Design a protein around this ligand. Structure first.
Ligand SMILES: Nc1ncnc2c1ncn2[C@@H]1O[C@H](COP(=O)(O)OP(=O)(O)NP(=O)(O)O)[C@@H](O)[C@H]1O
Ligand SMILES: [Mg+2]
Lengths: 214, 289, 87, 34, 237, 298, 49, 101, 101
């Protein structure tokens, strides 16, 4: 019984270390199951102890991670979901449900539902026929046809995850800073599947001819 | 032959320990300062009854920042109360680095050696300590002379010695060639302990107050659902799991992040809680009427 | 009173600013400091959880790294200059 | 009254498990092993 | 081995060689060790030098007649070069004369009364530490009350390190008597003393005096364990 | 003045100071130590940071006769402002335990210094009451009815301790006790349920004897108390009410849920029974094989 | 009242405006001295371009 | 699959990497790392549509980093002699590819 | 009894601040090795006492302490971005008959 109290107190001590303050780093690769190597936000490569009974299944894939500041050690792990790509301050979610998206272009509203709502909601149907999940959707027409609004409405009320990004999020002044966000979007979607990817601005990004004049 | 030259077991009162902590923490980042008041008897006994933090100085730990106007003044007020104690050293913080005397500070500590012959320099490092226990050490000047004349062995008699391996190079060289480190003990009376220990009667008055009872149902309900989701992975795990070689099995049937362990943990938490919840509910009811 | 005002500031001591990079929980928040390294910090009890919103500029202890309070939006000079005009 | 009994029955199960369980282990620790 | 590997200037090493060797040659006089390890011997200082004279008495245990004779130059009067020699010879005598003759107890008893004033002089503190261990050994199981009284006067002086030696020395002399007056005084004094070495000495002495005291030490055990000091609990045990 | 005084939080540091100071001034034979308390004020939480003894004399022969040194209070103010400027003069501690009417008179000198109603912090030094080692009381001035003159009197406020961060962290390294309450495991709170009942029972009996003392020993009737007791009889659950029937239903559910959790633990304990057996079964073979192989080799 | 400094130490610090230094004298993109330990606006400096 | 090697897709410029040091010379360093981690199929996808202006120009530090990698395949000849590093390139058109290839 | 030791022991390990990672560039004749600490500059810093300079080879990635930078243990597996890339890409399951014609 005496040793039970020590044990209990021994865990309490570790919780203080686990607790705030903390600093974010990024778990790299293992060197070993129970010792790994990480990189901090500060570019420093620390070889750190993997504390007992922590995540392993996902820890080894390069993934975002927390480090206790004073120990400079891996005390607990973050979801990949943590530290999401640069993304819009307001809601992805649409606050309106009244919808004029219903009343006129109704035929197109069903079509979008067909390609997009119908596989996620009913997975079951697809499995039985044997098809591959329906292919991506390009929306083009003259603007002032509410393209970015007809599809938003659906994402909002289906209540599957919705990631709403712009080319403007991606754009960067630096060197190699754009692409690292791009890799994050694709993976971020897989993590939190079923998931809806909509890039509103793509026109700007595509060019007729490549250049390097500036 | 020579004197014992055994560094004092520095009996740093609970009052002095708490008091260095307050001044040092708030005063970050500026390296704070002050004197330690106590009494030295025998060959190895200093009790640090109390300390007081000299007004901040923008110069940092310096010979400038040690100052006799403050020294005189506080002590003259303590005359009136009879709580007067002689200067037996000085403390300061280096919070921007671990516990070790600077090259500047060795000159300074030597001035204090003239004042009092058993003077300490006690470095308290407040930001880097996470508990006010670790990275705190006590020091006392060892002359340049000692190092040349091979008098260091005389200096470490009747002691166990304390090495701080961490922090080396330079810093460590200076430390070894300047001071001698010895263990630090905390002494307190049991009247103090009882105060430390004490809480209140409104502590237990609160412990008879009861939450809204719908919220208690929420928790009982939740636990049952909670445990369903982890009982599937546990169910899967034990379907076969007979295959030779334990190490392989740990990856295959997910023995890491053990579902058996995790199930017993949730059940047991909710259980101890619901015994307290039914008990408290009944006790209050019968007590009152 | 004026000279006494300096004694009082000295004990106050500076602060580090980030911004609420992403709400994860009421308990713990993810902030990205303006100077650099992203940190996970705690909330103080007087500051409200709902004052905290994504993109709000926040101030935090240097020492403990704990969100003290919201600051007003601390606009870049370029958009600050446009506001500044009264014609 | 009904449920009070049902708890006691489970507890009685646990005890039966615990006592029996250790009796082979004694044998093995005492026996030499490779 | 001792000379070759273990360094004599370093104090902790020198203590280990002195103790191991004292036993090697014990129970017969041997000067072989002094001669072999003569350069080694000159290196000594501080408490390494106290142990160096006391080593001699472990070696010279037995051959009682020639016990005093060899220790003759090192005694006070005949030595005042070094206080560590003066003091560590008296400890040294008491080793040979452990449990043997009472002619020896008498001599040491004189030295205690001489120095039971100020132990504040530096030589005196060292001297009187050895004297106090010394006389306890010599008087083992005598139950000489004269000895016991002498080491009280050292205690009450509150001599820095000799307070411990004296406290131990009482319990070795009066071994297993459980005299209640002795028990009462020690136990009470240990609270007053704030310095830990003196306190440890008295805690441990309380145990010595209650050797084979059986169920008549039961009064003592309850108080010591219940004492809030860790020190008295350690000796309680 | 400010009426903001709601809570008084008291650092563990103030308490340590006051004890030490009491015993270094060697105020004994109910010689009162009176010392100053510094911290913030004119806040809902008064944050009591520190205390330092003032020179003080109290004569047992007559309690009107005491000294207190005016100049010392003054000297300390410019020193304490430099040290930490959030400190202000806020009142005085008394060694207590007794609540005197000499404290109305001492409060009036502190009332000269202070910007708030003088905070009287009764730090008990004997520590007889284990719980409540502190009482807090604030001087008020209020219209006393029955056609009597306005009285200055002491109204209790929450003296309850909260502690600062810096103080607390060291304290926690020192102790490892299960204290008056930690709300730890099951064992700890189970103790608590007995102790806490006993707290109430003690509290309750005193209220019974207070009512005897009104009508036997002629205390002036403190009607406030009587007001509170009316609220106790009136807001007292009444039995035979169908609310009680509802209560019993809630009880029935939780006692059942306990039963289902008890069974699930059986399944966990039962798994351990088999796995250990499996291990034993392999080991029997390991040990048998040692014996045969030692024979063959020899 | 409050000041955002961007230091020459390459740090960004939100500091209590020192009351001794006037709110008037101060302005956006004033060059200023700042105490080296604890970051407070110590004094004002002739501007450099 | 049938070859049974480590198929490491490296898609694109390694200026995206910024983990330690500049990403520029990490391009070049690919040789070193492929050697250690053999058997390897380096599947260098990179269309080289980062600018037609530098395909046809003399300008372009992207072109320079690219170039230093190609040379390592024929100076060091670590991959050639003991083949276990195949240098599989893939571009959409043969005609938008850098002409040092 | 054994379990409580393990929990406590982990805590005692974490205490050590920093701890780093370099690569031995060469061995030198005073019994030191020139390490390139990977984020930082180069430092010449001794071998651990436990392992001799014969054991080490050119380009061995090593772990490092931070309180003296003296080498800790040799890395079991080379730290390089390429390793991580393989992990993600996964072992090819595609075969020739996935694509017909
Ligand atoms: N269901 C719909 N049918 C017809 N028009 C629509 C519909 N929904 C919205 N609109 C109209 O479209 C206008 C602009 O909507 P908006 O979302 O900007 O369109 P868009 O076609 O995506 N073009 P752009 O503004 O260039 O991105 C509104 O002002 C509405 O009048
Ligand atoms: Mg649009």
């Amino acid at each position: 019984r005496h040793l039970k109290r020590e044990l209990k107190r021994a865990q309490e001590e570790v919780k203080r270390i686990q607790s705030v303050p903390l600093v974010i780093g990024q778990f790299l690769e293992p060197i070993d199951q129970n010792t790994g190597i990480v990189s901090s936000t500060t570019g420093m490569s620390y070889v750190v102890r993997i504390l007992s009974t922590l995540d392993r299944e996902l820890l080894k894939p390069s993934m975002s991670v927390a480090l206790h500041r004073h120990s400079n050690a891996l005390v607990d792990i973050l979801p990949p979901d943590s530290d999401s790509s640069i993304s819009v301050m307001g809601e992805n979610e649409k606050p309106d449900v009244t919808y004029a998206d219903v009343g006129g272009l109704d035929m197109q509203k069903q079509e979008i539902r067909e390609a997009v709502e119908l596989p996620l909601v009913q997975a079951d149907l697809y499995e039985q026929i044997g098809i591959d999940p329906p292919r991506g959707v390009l929306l083009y027409g003259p603007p002032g046809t509410g393209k970015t609004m007809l599809v938003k409405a659906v994402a909002n009320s289906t209540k599957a995850a919705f990631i709403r990004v712009n080319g403007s999020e991606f754009v960067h002044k630096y060197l190699g800073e754009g692409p690292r966000m791009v890799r994050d979007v694709f993976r971020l979607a897989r993590e939190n599947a079923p998931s809806i990817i909509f890039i509103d601005e793509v026109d700007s990004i595509a060019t007729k001819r490549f250049d390097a004049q500036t | 032959t020579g004197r014992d030259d055994t560094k004092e077991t520095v009996y740093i009162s609970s009052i002095a320990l708490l008091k260095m902590l307050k001044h040092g923490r708030a005063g970050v980042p500026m390296e704070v300062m002050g004197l330690m008041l106590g009494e030295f008897v025998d060959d190895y006994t200093v009790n640090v009854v109390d300390v007081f933090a000299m007004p901040q100085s923008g110069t940092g730990v310096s010979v400038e920042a040690v100052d006799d106007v403050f020294q005189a003044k506080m002590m003259d007020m303590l005359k009136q109360t009879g709580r007067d104690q002689m200067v037996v050293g000085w403390y300061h913080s280096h919070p921007g680095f671990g516990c070790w005397l600077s090259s500047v500070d060795v000159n300074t500590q030597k001035s204090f050696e003239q004042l009092n012959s058993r003077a300490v320099a006690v470095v308290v490092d407040p930001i880097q300590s996470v508990k006010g226990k670790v990275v705190i050490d006590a020091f006392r000047l060892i002359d340049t002379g000692a190092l040349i004349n091979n008098l260091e062995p005389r200096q470490t008699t009747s002691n166990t010695g304390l090495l701080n391996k961490a922090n080396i190079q330079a810093l460590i060289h200076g430390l070894n060639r300047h001071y001698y480190s010895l263990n630090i003990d905390y002494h307190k009376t049991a009247k103090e302990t009882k105060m430390l220990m004490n809480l209140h009667k409104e502590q237990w008055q609160s412990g008879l107050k009861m939450y809204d009872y719908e919220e208690k149902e929420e928790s009982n309900l939740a636990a049952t659902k909670s445990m369903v989701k982890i009982a599937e992975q546990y169910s899967k795990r034990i379907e076969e799991e007979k295959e030779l070689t334990e190490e392989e099995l740990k990856t295959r049937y997910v023995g890491r992040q053990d579902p058996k362990k995790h199930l017993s943990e949730t059940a047991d938490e909710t259980l101890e809680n619901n015994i307290v919840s039914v008990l408290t509910a009944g006790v209050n009811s019968v007590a009152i009427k | 009173d004026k000279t006494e005002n300096d004694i009082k500031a000295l004990q106050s001591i500076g602060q580090l600013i980030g911004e609420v990079m992403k709400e994860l929980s009421e308990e713990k928040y993810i902030v990205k400091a303006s100077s650099g390294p992203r940190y996970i910090v705690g909330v103080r009890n007087s500051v409200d959880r709902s004052k905290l919103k994504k993109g709000v500029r926040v101030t935090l202890d240097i020492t403990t790294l704990t969100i003290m309070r919201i600051l007003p939006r601390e606009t870049d000079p370029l958009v600050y200059n446009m506001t500044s005009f009264e014609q | 009254q009904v449920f009070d009994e049902r708890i006691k029955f489970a507890n009685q199960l646990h005890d039966e498990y615990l006592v029996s369980m250790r009796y082979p282990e004694d044998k093995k620790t005492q026996q030499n092993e490779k | 081995k001792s000379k070759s590997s273990l360094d004599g200037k370093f104090s902790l090493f020198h203590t280990a060689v002195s103790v191991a060797n004292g036993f090697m040659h014990a129970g017969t006089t041997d000067n072989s060790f002094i001669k072999a390890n003569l350069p080694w011997l000159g290196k000594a200082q501080n408490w390494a030098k106290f142990t160096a004279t006391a080593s001699l008495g472990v070696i010279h245990k037995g051959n009682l007649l020639e016990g005093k004779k060899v220790m003759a130059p090192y005694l006070p009067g005949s030595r005042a070069s070094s206080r560590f020699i003066k003091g560590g010879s008296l400890y040294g005598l008491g080793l040979i004369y452990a449990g043997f003759g009472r002619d020896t107890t008498d001599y040491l008893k004189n030295i205690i009364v001489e120095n039971s004033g100020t132990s504040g002089d530096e030589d005196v503190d060292v001297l009187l530490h050895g004297a106090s261990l010394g006389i306890g050994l010599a008087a083992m199981g005598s139950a000489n009350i004269e000895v016991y009284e002498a080491l009280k006067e050292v205690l009450y002086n509150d001599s820095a390190t000799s307070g411990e030696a004296a406290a131990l020395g009482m319990g070795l002399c009066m071994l297993g008597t459980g005299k209640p007056e002795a028990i009462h005084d020690m136990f009470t004094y240990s609270q007053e003393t704030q310095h830990g070495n003196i306190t440890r000495g008295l805690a441990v002495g309380l145990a010595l005096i209650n050797y084979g005291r059986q169920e008549l030490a039961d009064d003592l055990i309850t108080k010591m364990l219940a004492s809030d000091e860790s020190l008295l609990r350690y000796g309680g045990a | 003045m400010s009426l903001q005084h709601e809570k008084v939080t008291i650092a563990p540091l103030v308490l340590l100071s006051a004890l030490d100071h009491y015993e270094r001034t060697q105020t004994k034979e109910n010689k009162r130590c009176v010392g100053v308390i510094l911290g913030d004020a004119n806040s809902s939480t008064i944050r009591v940071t520190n205390s330092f003894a003032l020179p003080f004399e109290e004569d047992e022969k007559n309690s009107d006769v005491w000294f207190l040194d005016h100049n010392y209070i003054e000297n300390m103010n410019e020193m304490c402002k430099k040290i930490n400027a959030k400190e202000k003069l806020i009142g005085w501690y008394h060694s207590g335990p007794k609540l005197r009417a000499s404290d109305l008179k001492i409060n009036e000198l502190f009332k000269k210094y202070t910007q708030n109603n003088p905070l009287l912090l009764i730090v008990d030094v004997k520590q007889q009451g284990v719980g409540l080692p502190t009482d807090a009381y604030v001087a008020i001035e209020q219209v006393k009815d029955d056609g009597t003159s306005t009285e200055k009197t002491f109204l209790h406020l929450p003296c309850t301790i909260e502690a600062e961060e810096a103080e607390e962290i060291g304290v926690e390294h020192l102790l490892r006790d299960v204290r008056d309450q930690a709300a730890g495991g099951l064992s700890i709170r189970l103790t608590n349920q007995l102790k806490s009942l006993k707290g109430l029972q003690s509290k309750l009996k005193d209220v019974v004897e207070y009512l005897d003392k009104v009508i036997n020993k002629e205390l002036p009737i403190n009607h406030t108390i009587l007001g509170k007791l009316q609220d106790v009889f009136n807001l007292l659950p009444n039995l035979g009410t169908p609310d009680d029937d509802e209560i019993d239903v809630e009880n029935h559910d939780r006692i059942n849920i306990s039963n289902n959790l008890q069974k699930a633990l059986t399944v966990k304990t039962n798994d351990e029974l088999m796995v250990i057996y499996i291990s034993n079964l392999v080991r029997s073979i390991i040990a048998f094989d040692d014996l045969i192989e030692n024979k063959i080799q020899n | 009242k409050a000041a955002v400094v961007k230091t020459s130490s390459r740090q960004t610090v939100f500091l209590p405006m020192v009351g001794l230094v006037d709110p008037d004298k101060l302005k956006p993109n004033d060059l200023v001295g700042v105490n080296k330990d604890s970051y407070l606006i110590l004094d004002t400096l002739p501007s450099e371009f | 699959h049938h070859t049974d090697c480590k198929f490491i897709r490296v898609s694109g410029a390694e200026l995206v990497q910024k983990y330690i040091g500049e990403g520029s010379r990490m391009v070049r360093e690919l040789f070193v790392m492929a050697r250690e981690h053999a058997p390897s199929i380096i599947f260098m996808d990179e269309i080289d549509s980062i600018g037609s202006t530098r395909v046809e120009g003399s300008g372009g530090g992207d072109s320079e980093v690219q170039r230093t990698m190609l040379e390592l395949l024929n100076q060091l000849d670590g991959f050639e002699t003991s083949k276990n590093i195949k240098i599989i390139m893939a571009t959409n058109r043969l005609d938008i590819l850098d002409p040092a290839l | 009894n054994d379990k409580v030791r393990f929990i406590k022991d982990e805590l005692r390990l974490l205490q050590e601040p920093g701890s780093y990672v370099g690569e031995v560039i060469k061995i030198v004749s005073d019994k030191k090795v020139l390490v390139k600490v990977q984020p930082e500059g180069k430092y010449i810093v001794d071998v651990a006492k436990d392992i001799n300079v014969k054991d080490l080879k050119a380009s061995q990635r090593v772990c490092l302490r931070s309180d003296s930078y003296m080498l800790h243990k040799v890395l079991e597996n080379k730290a390089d971005p390429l390793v991580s890339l393989m992990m993600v890409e996964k072992v090819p399951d595609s075969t020739y008959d996935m694509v017909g014609g």
